Amino acid sequence: MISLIAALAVDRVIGMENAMPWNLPADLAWFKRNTLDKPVIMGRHTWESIGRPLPGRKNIILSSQPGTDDRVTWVKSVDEAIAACGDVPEIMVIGGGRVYEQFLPKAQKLYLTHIDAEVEGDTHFPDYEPDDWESVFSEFHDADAQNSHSYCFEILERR
Ligand SMILES: NC(=O)C1=CN([C@@H]2O[C@H](COP(=O)(O)OP(=O)(O)OC[C@H]3O[C@@H](n4cnc5c(N)ncnc54)[C@H](OP(=O)(O)O)[C@@H]3O)[C@@H](O)[C@H]2O)C=CC1
Numbered sequence: 705m706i707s708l709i710a711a712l713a714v715d716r717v718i719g720m721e722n723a724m725p726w727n728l729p730a731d732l733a734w735f736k737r738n739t740l741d742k743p744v745i746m747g748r749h750t751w752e753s754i755g756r757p758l759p760g761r762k763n764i765i766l767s768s769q770p771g772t773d774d775r776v777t778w779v780k781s782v783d784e785a786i787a788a789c790g791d792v793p794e795i796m797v798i799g800g801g802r803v804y805e806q807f808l809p810k811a812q813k814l815y816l817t818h819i820d821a822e823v824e825g826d827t828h829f830p831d832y833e834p835d836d837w838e839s840v841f842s843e844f845h846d847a848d849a850q851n852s853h854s855y856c857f858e859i860l861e862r863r
């Protein structure tokens with residue numbers, strides 16, 4: 705199964721200048737929790753945004769140009785990326801925008817962090833068809849001393 709995981713601000717903004725224009729420790733925790741011990745697929749800009757392999761997960765980078773770091777696995781197509789994961793129960797697509805778009809249709813699950821924050825962005829999560837998804841998990845949280853925004857974790861499964 706292929707899953708997409710992301711954090712969306714208002715208007716589905718997910719990034720600005722290769723970065724997440726917010727500070728939410730709780731979302732990073734949720735991310736580590738739902739990706740640990742699973743292969744992660746990401747675009748190259750998203751690879752450069754992190755600078756180092758995510759610990760305890762197989763890192764697959766999608767790029768049309770030759771790979772430049774052997775600490776990770778480089779692939780040149782969606783199909784090679786999926787094949788590179790082998791036989792695992794779940795494949796986590798962690799971004800960015802152009803990669804989400806490509807993997808969305810093969811997706812069976814969406815892990816979304818809805819952040820109540822307005823932020824100018826240059827990158828947006830795909831405009832998915834709400835009718836095709838079913839909310840199977842929803843957990844809302846008010847802002848607190850560590851997390852400056854109210855946010856909600858949601859898991860959608862393709863109907
Ligand atoms: N808020 C959230 O949850 C998230 C936010 N982000 C944010 O997303 C933004 C980066 O997103 P964006 O610019 O779209 O970039 P991506 O990370 O999606 O990078 C895309 C790059 O990877 C390669 N690639 C993608 N698809 C293919 C394919 N099918 N075949 C071959 N190569 C492919 C290409 O690199 P090449 O040029 O080498 O061909 C392409 O330019 C940043 O702003 C980041 O901070 C990212 C993940 C989650």
Ligand SMILES: Cc1cc(CSC(=N)NC(=N)N)c(C)cc1CSC(=N)NC(=N)N
Nearest residue numbers: 709710711723724735750753754798799817
């Ligand atoms: C650390 C990091 C992780 C990601 C992947 S996050 C994700 N797919 N899902 C989710 N958050 N729930 C991304 C896209 C970017 C980063 C680094 S962000 C950053 N560097 N911000 C900044 N420079 N201030």
Ligand SMILES: [Mn+2]
Nearest residue numbers: 838839840861
């Ligand atoms: Mn049901």
Ligand SMILES: [Mn+2]
Nearest residue numbers: 838861862863
């Ligand atoms: Mn069904």
